[PDB]
Design a protein around this ligand. Structure first.
Ligand SMILES: Cc1cc2nc3c(=O)[nH]c(=O)nc-3n(C[C@H](O)[C@H](O)[C@H](O)COP(=O)(O)O)c2cc1C
Length: 177
């Protein structure tokens, strides 16, 4: 299990597609880079994936088991992804659905994010529950029907991909408890 506190942002450097599988090469920050090796199981946008190789600061993962139930299929070279190495709140790295951002509102110190949750998940989500969105675990301010409202501190953008999100952005969600 993981904290759901993002350690740093990686940048997708390469994507190779070969038969309902994709290999993503992701440029890592040095500290996170020094904490991983081939075989490391870590969180990428909140999803458990296994490091299959490393070349320089580029860390590669094969997306195959996760390919139909995560946002990886739709990501592009240059996209930022959240990273967390394994040490509530606590995230397992089993993504429960792909949700879509409904609205992002930027204010002076906050990022107000509204996310349309898959219908199959909404019956077990109340306001004030913790939820993982791309591996950031934070509480829900409100839910009305299938839309959840999370109010993030804007400073979270220096260590995460939250500042890159807009309406229509898909996200990995992990429901807790
Ligand atoms: C130890 C661990 C390592 C995993 N490594 C990968 C992997 O490298 N590639 C992948 O596609 N899925 C991997 N998975 C599976 C994804 O985490 C999983 O498919 C996704 O979170 C949850 O979606 P699912 O239940 O629809 O499969 C791993 C799971 C675990 C527990």
């Amino acid at each position: 299990m993981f904290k759901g506190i993002v350690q740093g942002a990686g940048i997708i450097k390469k994507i190779s597609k070969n038969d309902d599988t994709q290999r993503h090469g992701i440029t890592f920050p040095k500290d996170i880079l020094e904490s991983v090796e081939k075989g490391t199981v870590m969180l990428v946008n909140g999803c458990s994936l296994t490091v299959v190789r490393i070349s320089g600061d580029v860390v590669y993962f094969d997306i195959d088991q996760a390919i139909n139930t995560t946002t990886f299929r739709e990501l592009e070279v240059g996209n930022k992804v959240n990273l967390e190495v394994r040490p509530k709140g606590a995230l397992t790295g089993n993504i429960k659905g792909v949700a879509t951002v409904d609205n992002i509102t930027e204010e002076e110190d906050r990022l107000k994010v509204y996310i349309k949750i898959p219908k199959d998940l909404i019956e077990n989500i109340l306001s004030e529950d913790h939820i993982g969105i791309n591996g950031v675990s934070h509480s829900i301010e409100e839910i009305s029907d299938d839309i959840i409202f999370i109010n993030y501190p804007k400073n979270l953008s220096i260590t995460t991909n939250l500042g890159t999100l807009e309406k229509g952005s898909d996200v990995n969600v992990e429901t807790l408890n």
